[model samples]
Target chain A: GAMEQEAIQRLRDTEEMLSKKQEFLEKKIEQELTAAKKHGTKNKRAALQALKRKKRYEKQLAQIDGTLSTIEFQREALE
Target chain B: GAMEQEAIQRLRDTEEMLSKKQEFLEKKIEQELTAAKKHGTKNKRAALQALKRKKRYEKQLAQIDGTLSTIEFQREALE
Candidate 1:
């Protein structure tokens, strides 16, 4: 149906956007981890903050992963 | 009354989450900026990577800001 096509397109767009974001987030998370390691014991606050940033990035990454899975399933179902 | 309390609590939780994340991100951004500066004219790859990480963190921080603003408004309206 035309509706299925429309839904698929939207889901694809979402997937594409999230994929790009995930790439960016992964790099950012890696950088944070490096920073946390670099600042170990030298700057406790900075290290904790870096670790927290890593946590947040990871959380978003998990969310996007979950959403992508759902979208993929829905698209597959529609096809 | 109870409904408002629940909404407020939920919104507060979200706000807390975003605020903490924002703080963490800001710290990370600063660290990345420093790394970029240190690597300036010297490890191009690492420097570029640091800059890219800073950009991504900034983007996420901006998104969190927008979400927090919306949540704040919703919580206020419900009050």
Candidate 2:
């Protein structure tokens, strides 16, 4: 059942996980930003990469949010 | 199988609970206002009854909201 019809629960879990990841990465990177400037890991590229990853996670989170809404709509449709 | 014909099953009694409770949020109290409007039960009494119901609902809602936020924070904390 690889490409089988995805279930609502799977979609729900994905939405929840991604949302948490988004919050974590966003806050972590934000908190690090100020200290990252005066820090020893003068690796601007590394910091930039982390930021990019945060953005990517946020994008994925948004997609899951849409999927979550779709599922909720479906769940409530007949009930 | 009363439920699971699948390997893993997820059962949530909440999302719907919150959604359903929201439907009656702050509105159930209004009903008391309408019903208690006759004599003997002065407008003051009716108003107080509605106010009391409103406060009760708000208390229930606050408890629910607190649980929701705690769950959210716990979920996010893992990420």
Among these predictions, the greatest lDDT belongs to 1
Per-residue lDDT of A66 in model 1:
60
RMSD of each: 24.5, 13.0
For model 1, state the Cα shift of residue B40 in Å.
Answer: 1.4
Docking class of 2: incorrect
Least accurate stretch of 10 residues (summed lDDT) in model 2 chain A? A1-10
Question: Model 2: which residue pairs collide?
Answer: none
Evaluated with TM-score, which candidate comes out highest?
1
Clashing pairs in 1: none
> Residue by residue across B22-73, what tens digits does model 1's lDDT show?
7878999999999999998989999999999999888867766765665566
The Cα local distance difference test for each model comes to: 0.70, 0.49
Count of backbone collisions in candidate 1: 0
